[PDB]
Amino acid sequence: MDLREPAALSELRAELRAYFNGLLPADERRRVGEQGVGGERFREVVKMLGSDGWLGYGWPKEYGGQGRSISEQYVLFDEVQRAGLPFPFVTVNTVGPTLMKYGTEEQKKKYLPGILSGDIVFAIGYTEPGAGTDLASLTTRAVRDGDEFVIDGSKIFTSGANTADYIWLACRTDPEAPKHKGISIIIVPTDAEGFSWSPIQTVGGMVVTATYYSGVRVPVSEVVGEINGGWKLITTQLNHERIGLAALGGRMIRLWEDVVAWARDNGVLEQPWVRRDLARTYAKLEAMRLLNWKMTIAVENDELTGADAGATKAYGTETHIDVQRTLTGILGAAGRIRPESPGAVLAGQIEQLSRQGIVNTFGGGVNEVLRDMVATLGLGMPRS
Amino acid sequence: MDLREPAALSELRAELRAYFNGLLPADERRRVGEQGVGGERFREVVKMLGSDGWLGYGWPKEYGGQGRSISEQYVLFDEVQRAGLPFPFVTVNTVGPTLMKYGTEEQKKKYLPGILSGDIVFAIGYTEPGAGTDLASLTTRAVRDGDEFVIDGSKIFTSGANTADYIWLACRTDPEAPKHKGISIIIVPTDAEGFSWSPIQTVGGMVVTATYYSGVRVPVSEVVGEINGGWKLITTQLNHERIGLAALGGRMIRLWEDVVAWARDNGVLEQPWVRRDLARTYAKLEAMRLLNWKMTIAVENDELTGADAGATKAYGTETHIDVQRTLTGILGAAGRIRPESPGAVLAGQIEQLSRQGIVNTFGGGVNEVLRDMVATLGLGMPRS
Amino acid sequence: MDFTLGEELTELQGLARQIFTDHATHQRLRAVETSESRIDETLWRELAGAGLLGVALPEAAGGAGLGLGALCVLLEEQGRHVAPVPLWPTLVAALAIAEHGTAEQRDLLPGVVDGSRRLTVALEEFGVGDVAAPGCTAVPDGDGWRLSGTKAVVPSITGAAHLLVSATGPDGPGLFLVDADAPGLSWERTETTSRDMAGNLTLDAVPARALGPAALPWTLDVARTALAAVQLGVASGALHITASYLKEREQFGRPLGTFQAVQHQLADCYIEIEAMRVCLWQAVCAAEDGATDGKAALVAKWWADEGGLNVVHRTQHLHGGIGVDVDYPIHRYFLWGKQISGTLGGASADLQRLGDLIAEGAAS
Amino acid sequence: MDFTLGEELTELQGLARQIFTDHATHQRLRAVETSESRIDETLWRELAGAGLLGVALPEAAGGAGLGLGALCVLLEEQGRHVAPVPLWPTLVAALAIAEHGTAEQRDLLPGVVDGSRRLTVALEEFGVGDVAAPGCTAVPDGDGWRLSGTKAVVPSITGAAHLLVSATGPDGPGLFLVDADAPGLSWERTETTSRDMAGNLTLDAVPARALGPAALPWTLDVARTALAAVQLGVASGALHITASYLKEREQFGRPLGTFQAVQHQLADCYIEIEAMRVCLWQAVCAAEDGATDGKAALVAKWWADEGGLNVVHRTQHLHGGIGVDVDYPIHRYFLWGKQISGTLGGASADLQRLGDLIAEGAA
Numbered sequence A, B: 001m002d003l004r005e006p007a008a009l010s011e012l013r014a015e016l017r018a019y020f021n022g023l024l025p026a027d028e029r030r031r032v033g034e035q036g037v038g039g040e041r042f043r044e045v046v047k048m049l050g051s052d053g054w055l056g057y058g059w060p061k062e063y064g065g066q067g068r069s070i071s072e073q074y075v076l077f078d079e080v081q082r083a084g085l086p087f088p089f090v091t092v093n094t095v096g097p098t099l100m101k102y103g104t105e106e107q108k109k110k111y112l113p114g115i116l117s118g119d120i121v122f123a124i125g126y127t128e129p130g131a132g133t134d135l136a137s138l139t140t141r142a143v144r145d146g147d148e149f150v151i152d153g154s155k156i157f158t159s160g161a162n163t164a165d166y167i168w169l170a171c172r173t174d175p176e177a178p179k180h181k182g183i184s185i186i187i188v189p190t191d192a193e194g195f196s197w198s199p200i201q202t203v204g205g206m207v208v209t210a211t212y213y214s215g216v217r218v219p220v221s222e223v224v225g226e227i228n229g230g231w232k233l234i235t236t237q238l239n240h241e242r243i244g245l246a247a248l249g250g251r252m253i254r255l256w257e258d259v260v261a262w263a264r265d266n267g268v269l270e271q272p273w274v275r276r277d278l279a280r281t282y283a284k285l286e287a288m289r290l291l292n293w294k295m296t297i298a299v300e301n302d303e304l305t306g307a308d309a310g311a312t313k314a315y316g317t318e319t320h321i322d323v324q325r326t327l328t329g330i331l332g333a334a335g336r337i338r339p340e341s342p343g344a345v346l347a348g349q350i351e352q353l354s355r356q357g358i359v360n361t362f363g364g365g366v367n368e369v370l371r372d373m374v375a376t377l378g379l380g381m382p383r384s
Numbered sequence C: 001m002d003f004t005l006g007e008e009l010t011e012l013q014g015l016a017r018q019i020f021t022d023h024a025t026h027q028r029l030r031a032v033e034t035s036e037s038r039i040d041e042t043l044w045r046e047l048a049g050a051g052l053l054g055v056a057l058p059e060a061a062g063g064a065g066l067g068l069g070a071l072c073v074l075l076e077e078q079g080r081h082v083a084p085v086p087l088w089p090t091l092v093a094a095l096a097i098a099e100h101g102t103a104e105q106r107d108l109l110p111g112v113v114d115g116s117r118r119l120t121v122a123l124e125e126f127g128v129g130d131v132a133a134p135g136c137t138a139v140p141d142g143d144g145w146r147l148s149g150t151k152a153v154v155p156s157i158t159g160a161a162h163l164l165v166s167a168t169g170p171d172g173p174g175l176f177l178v179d180a181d182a183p184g185l186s187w188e189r190t191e192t193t194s195r196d197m198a199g200n201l202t203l204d205a206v207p208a209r210a211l212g213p214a215a216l217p218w219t220l221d222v223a224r225t226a227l228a229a230v231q232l233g234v235a236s237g238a239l240h241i242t243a244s245y246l247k248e249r250e251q252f253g254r255p256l257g258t259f260q261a262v263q264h265q266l267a268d269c270y271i272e273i274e275a276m277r278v279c280l281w282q283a284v285c286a287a288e289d290g291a292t293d294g295k296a297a298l299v300a301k302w303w304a305d306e307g308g309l310n311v312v313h314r315t316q317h318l319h320g321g322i323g324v325d326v327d328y329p330i331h332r333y334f335l336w337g338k339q340i341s342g343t344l345g346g347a348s349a350d351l352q353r354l355g356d357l358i359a360e361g362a363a364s
Numbered sequence D: 001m002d003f004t005l006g007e008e009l010t011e012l013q014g015l016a017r018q019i020f021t022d023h024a025t026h027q028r029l030r031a032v033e034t035s036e037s038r039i040d041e042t043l044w045r046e047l048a049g050a051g052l053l054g055v056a057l058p059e060a061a062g063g064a065g066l067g068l069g070a071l072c073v074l075l076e077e078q079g080r081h082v083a084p085v086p087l088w089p090t091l092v093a094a095l096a097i098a099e100h101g102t103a104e105q106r107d108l109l110p111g112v113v114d115g116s117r118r119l120t121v122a123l124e125e126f127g128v129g130d131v132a133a134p135g136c137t138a139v140p141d142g143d144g145w146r147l148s149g150t151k152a153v154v155p156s157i158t159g160a161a162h163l164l165v166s167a168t169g170p171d172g173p174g175l176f177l178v179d180a181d182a183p184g185l186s187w188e189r190t191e192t193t194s195r196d197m198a199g200n201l202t203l204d205a206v207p208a209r210a211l212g213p214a215a216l217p218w219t220l221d222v223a224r225t226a227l228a229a230v231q232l233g234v235a236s237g238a239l240h241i242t243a244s245y246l247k248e249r250e251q252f253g254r255p256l257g258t259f260q261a262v263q264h265q266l267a268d269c270y271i272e273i274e275a276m277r278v279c280l281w282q283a284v285c286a287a288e289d290g291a292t293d294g295k296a297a298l299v300a301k302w303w304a305d306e307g308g309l310n311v312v313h314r315t316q317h318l319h320g321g322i323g324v325d326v327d328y329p330i331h332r333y334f335l336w337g338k339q340i341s342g343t344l345g346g347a348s349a350d351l352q353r354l355g356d357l358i359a360e361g362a363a
């Protein structure tokens, strides 16, 4: 039972840390992190990462990737988010890998090289106003017309649709089939006639979108996998997505450390209640950091249970909120000051993240569903 | 919007506290409080309370009681339990009042005078091994045989059956009717042929029982209310029970105050973590104390809602556990010493209460069921 | 005892609810929260003309004389509607002046009542920020005083004609009135979580007039109580919106409101709000009785800071994606609940302050 | 890294599981928990014969030399069976002596390995009870020492041949070996939450021998880690029993484990146990690398004291009435988890101690 980072990973880490912190000045880097995949510098960042080879860091070498281990991919995902940079997670961790497994040779030739270089970015079109947690009830329609599909519907919370080149779109291709046997994944260019989007400004600052499909026509060959078998894609190949989300914890550890240094320097650290609060969040961040590595090692050995996955995700995202609340309390009167305003502490990052962390308890799996799965798959409870 | 106790009640409260703490010496009082309704001195205490007129304090004068107000009853229930004394709550607050409302004249003349004097005590026979939260599914059977009922079955957790004169027994008199319309209440004397009980030793110290009914024959004239009309009796006239259970919080306040003084006088109170824990439990006990009074006042005005009753009960019993956990931590090494062993702090009361508080979250209404009721009845949610 | 509003406070509640409902619409909130002052001046004027700025202030001032309980009823309605007007900074400052101010300070109160004069309070500082021991310094200047230091994130400072500023003089901490245009006073506008425009104040030997010597501990307790009243409103409004939404939003063929974990999260919000409410009104009674120990106000404020923040976190989660949308109403309850729960210090700082009062009460 | 036990510790775990399973039956627990010593002497003998008393101790002493991780694997299995034997007091004391004792004191260890010598540790006092700053005094007596003071609830004192007593000498806090028959030493038997029989120790100038100058902070950290390991086993066994119970117990026409609120309480237990476990092994690895700042042991112990007590409270509530019955198993886990979560101070005391180490490490 060795819980220590290998010396190889620590060197990689310190080098990635400097690289990512060096791409942009700190104030500019804060802004790009807030803006996420919807921002006007996202594609710029994606292109820099692609040009320097980081986008296919974890991809197999036979697809042009560096073929690095799951542990090294995890350090990369950790350090890019720790720097506050956006990273094209859905493209590199969902779209790429699914195309490698389910893609035609023509689909692979068309999308993979551009994803690698940062010239092609996807957004995921799953969620609908009427189908969120219950995604299998989606109703965006794809009707076959000869060699084409005609797509009519709308999606909501299509993150990055406004900067994406393609939508990874989930559609109802068989209205009569049982809900799980009637969905297809179809790739839709964001410049297709009949496609549009509208902004949704979030409280955290990033802009997401609703997307609309009015008579959009795509070739049948742009289906990924089996027609009516897209639910099998939506529910599999999730392990990269899981470690990507777990890697967000690195940033909260950074900000914990930065608050301690802030509090040491101005005397706030002398207060018993600050010390208690720092101690409790330290203990919770330790567990988070170790559970996140344990999941990562499991993925590396192909031994990750859905129970451990969901348990780790629910604890981690709830711990981010806890740490954000608690650290904000330690900041005192400065804790309410937004980024870009005078008096902000640590540039307002904790104030801003508090308004973002409140989404991750239902992104990447709804925590109530994940606790059901822990009880059912983890403890053998019958389904609720 | 007046949240103060009237001076009259405060005077009553001080006089009761002097009386109840004078009834038995502290160490004997602690023993009988731990032993509760199953104990060998329970009937002795009840008889003392009867002779002094406390049992019918809240009973109407037309039934031999003093007709005191609901607020005075709540003060009495608080102070008797604050002194650590057992009180025959089911007899005075469930059986008595239901006989007043539904008993025949013969039943009222037979049972009410003896209950007032402490010569008659009842145990409630509701719960079965297979019907706990789902009480309406009970299977203990009562088959009519002329002017008797023949009772076959078993009850579990029949608190006080070993010291009671009568069982207040819910039984199935109509196997064909819907489950809610086939139950009757029948009074079974504990010396009946075919009745027996066996002890269940609880982790908290008190002994409860299982009771068994093997061909027990009881007159039809000992049915309370109408045959098959028992479910209404079970699920109504609960306000007295609710305030008696709420009154249990008064002892947790007393013990919090005692630990503060204990900690003051050995230096423990200087530690910041101790002051913080006292403060949090004080804040939680204040909410409890005031919500308990709000419920009592609502009962006195006949406007208590089920949602409020359920919210207040669930909050209160969970706060008892929090205060017990937290106070045990403040006691340090002596927190683990059981009553009657040397080194015990405050006679081990907190150590023992911690092993008893773990029962009250599912007694007097299961807390999960009460939260469902809060959601549906208090907030309009459709039922889960 | 009694746990119900009198008929005067009930009438006041309904009048304030109707005004806030009228003005705190999506369109108006969006416009005000992107304005220079971040204050809804139309709503201020309607509250003035409806007599709601005077309702808590003394008859002498033109007010109704209904005191802290009336202010808390008004503030809870404001929280229920997340309506951006500086009621608690102006009216807590008015109550402090009424109770501890000189006669010339009290001459400001008629302009508060009639809507033409706003106040704010500067009670907090950056860093340790112990609100009972302000680092800002007061120096006697013959009969008056000159204040030197900095105050943090003073709320709704735009258009405020006077500030009550806490500072420490030779005889300990006190409360001082300063004119917004005084020489030596300056501030940087700074945007807060709730989208209010606050000011970081710099005072360079700024002339000021003392309030009475008990003013500061009393004002802190009244402000704690007032903030818990806003937070009670914020929590209640959030829970009502969320329950309404979950009755109608269907997933898996049924309302989300039928899932047990959903119902239990709702029921925990319901319980915290009931607890918050009784502790709030205990704090108002204590103030009415002239309570000086400070415990009840801190109990109220801790419930607002811990319970109220719990509620708005749950109502964000239970909404899913639509709750993040700034064009949908619930996010504003999160912003308000989050900011209020740290105002004058957060839940942990309250516990430490309260534990010390308990320890001190024990030895005397 | 790696989050799996190796070959040897997995074998050790299976041997401990078999032995505790054989002995910690309902009948034996009831007899032992009403006996005078409250200690399962048969189990103690089977542990010795199986090599389990020696597995964590040095080879010089006839043990296997597997160290602290061996001890934690054994203590986790103990906790999973709530089996009453003084493993952590004897084996923590034995590890202290192996690490900081004189050659003379290390001569005690063969008797511990073969099961004939039991030890305990006296690390707590009544009142403030700062375990790092014992009130009990140590006064030089020529080349030895004499101790005067009181120690509170010394665990499993009956039949202990020796005690490690923490006390403050002229050069600060230290750890001293005392024989249980030493003159001036007495105790009062006192029953604890777990049903152990502890002793409140009175020391009237009791002769004692010092361990090495680093012994006390080292021992407190090892004891915190060992207690975390017991509590992980307690919480894990408790969850397992409750899960099996709720799959079978039906109300409203279906198993209780089909209620979403029930599934979420179980899931929260599962999460707390996973967190407890990683934080325990981090403390073990920190002890291996010779860490002395004490943070990792306190993180581990806090998880035991907060999360572990959370688990056994949930498993009590989820059982309803049957869980209060002392003839049903789950109440014992509540008892153990309750007592362990206050041993050497509770969760709040740990957070205060941990926060001071963080602040001091910041400067």
Ligand SMILES: Cc1cc2nc3c(=O)[nH]c(=O)nc-3n(C[C@H](O)[C@H](O)[C@H](O)COP(=O)(O)OP(=O)(O)OC[C@H]3O[C@@H](n4cnc5c(N)ncnc54)[C@H](O)[C@@H]3O)c2cc1C
Pocket (backbone or CB within 6 Å): A090, A123, A124, A125, A126, A127, A128, A129, A131, A132, A133, A134, A155, A156, A157, A158, A159, A160, A359, A360, A361, A362, A363, A364, A366, A368, A369, C249, C251, C256, C259, C261, C262, C317, C318, C319, C320, C321, C322
């Ligand atoms: C950071 C982030 C990024 C996202 N990016 C994308 C993207 O690129 N593309 C995309 O299509 N979607 C995206 N999503 C959307 C996400 O998939 C949905 O928000 C999620 O599926 C929940 O759906 P919903 O918002 O409609 O919430 P609802 O389904 O309405 O659920 C609302 C709440 O109800 C409760 N609840 C729901 N079901 C249950 C249940 N069974 N038991 C108990 N409680 C329950 C939970 O508290 C939940 O939060 C993103 C979400 C987040 C947070």
Ligand SMILES: Cc1cc2nc3c(=O)[nH]c(=O)nc-3n(C[C@H](O)[C@H](O)[C@H](O)COP(=O)(O)OP(=O)(O)OC[C@H]3O[C@@H](n4cnc5c(N)ncnc54)[C@H](O)[C@@H]3O)c2cc1C
Pocket (backbone or CB within 6 Å): B090, B123, B124, B125, B126, B127, B128, B129, B131, B132, B133, B134, B155, B156, B157, B158, B159, B359, B360, B362, B363, B364, B366, B368, B369, D249, D251, D256, D259, D261, D262, D317, D318, D319, D320, D321, D322
């Ligand atoms: C102090 C005390 C006094 C008592 N006095 C009496 C008495 O005088 N007479 C008498 O007849 N009985 C008495 N009992 C027994 C008591 O009524 C029952 O224990 C209660 O009905 C719960 O039933 P159960 O024990 O069978 O638990 P179960 O019904 O088996 O429930 C076990 C657990 O399952 C969970 N659960 C149950 N239903 C739901 C649900 N719908 N949704 C989610 N979770 C759920 C809860 O966590 C619950 O604790 C008493 C019990 C106590 C603790």
Ligand SMILES: [Cl-]
Pocket (backbone or CB within 6 Å): A363, A364, A365
């Ligand atoms: Cl998602």
Ligand SMILES: [Cl-]
Pocket (backbone or CB within 6 Å): B363, B364, B365
């Ligand atoms: Cl009951």
Ligand SMILES: [Cl-]
Pocket (backbone or CB within 6 Å): C124, C125, C126, C150, C151, C152
């Ligand atoms: Cl400042």
Ligand SMILES: [Cl-]
Pocket (backbone or CB within 6 Å): C080, C081, C237, C240
């Ligand atoms: Cl509203």
